[PDB]
Amino acid sequence: IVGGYTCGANTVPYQVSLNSGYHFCGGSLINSQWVVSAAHCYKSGIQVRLGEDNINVVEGNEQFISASKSIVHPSYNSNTLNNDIMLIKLKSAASLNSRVASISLPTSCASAGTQCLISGWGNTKSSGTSYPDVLKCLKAPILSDSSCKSAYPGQITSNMFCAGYLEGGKDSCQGDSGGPVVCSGKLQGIVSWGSGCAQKNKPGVYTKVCNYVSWIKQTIASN
Numbered sequence: 001i002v003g004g005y006t007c008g009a010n011t012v013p014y015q016v017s018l019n020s021g022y023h024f025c026g027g028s029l030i031n032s033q034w035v036v037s038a039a040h041c042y043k044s045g046i047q048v049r050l051g052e053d054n055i056n057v058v059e060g061n062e063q064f065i066s067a068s069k070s071i072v073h074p075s076y077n078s079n080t081l082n083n084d085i086m087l088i089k090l091k092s093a094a095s096l097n098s099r100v101a102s103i104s105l106p107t108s109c110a111s112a113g114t115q116c117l118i119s120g121w122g123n124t125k126s127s128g129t130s131y132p133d134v135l136k137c138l139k140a141p142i143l144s145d146s147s148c149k150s151a152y153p154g155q156i157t158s159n160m161f162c163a164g165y166l167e168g169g170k171d172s173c174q175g176d177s178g179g180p181v182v183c184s185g186k187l188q189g190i191v192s193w194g195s196g197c198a199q200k201n202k203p204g205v206y207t208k209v210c211n212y213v214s215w216i217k218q219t220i221a222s223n
């Protein structure tokens, strides 16, 4: 997260860290046994870490649970990043509490202009590299469909939406990948892609979760 703020320990209870010997992606807890992340974050040997703030220090509220199954969307296209969503099932149910909680899935898509909360442990530099140990947060508005398509000609599908600031300075970045974009208390987006970080006229692009609720529900209903 570039140009954001320190969230505050466990203030984003649904935020998870995907670990494969190190933090490599974010994710969102949608219920005690399932996590929603980006399909491009896929890899084997994933351990889901919940209740995390500083990912390099055991602070006492964490829950480490290995993934038992990963399900990348059937139509995920890594070339275009269309359908960049993946479900991860935990080997065991997480113990839900005040610091580890699920985030509700949307019933309707978010409206352009809505201010959402983006979070993660990704790069905090626009030009250069610096990874925080504690969770970072960013308040960012959903940009217009028109502005999004103009920023990335011929690359924005109906399963994507842009959020951020065209003037640059505030954006998600490498490492926040797979993380949440919450608007009005609903998981409306997944940190997916963009062009660099916090660059002018190049806002972050996010997977439009509201288009996948049927697939998510059917999938967790049979797995």
Ligand SMILES: C[C@H](/N=C/c1cc(NC(=N)N)ccc1O)C(=O)O
Binding pocket: 040, 171, 172, 173, 174, 175, 176, 177, 178, 191, 192, 193, 194, 195, 196, 197, 198, 203, 204, 205
């Ligand atoms: C590191 C690289 N992902 C970069 C990445 C960048 C953004 N942000 C942005 N350009 N505004 C969001 C999600 C991402 O996964 C990768 O998958 O190898």
Ligand SMILES: [Ca+2]
Binding pocket: 052, 053, 054, 055, 056, 057, 058, 059, 062
């Ligand atoms: Ca920790």
Ligand SMILES: [Cu+2]
Binding pocket: 040, 174, 177, 192, 193
């Ligand atoms: Cu990425």
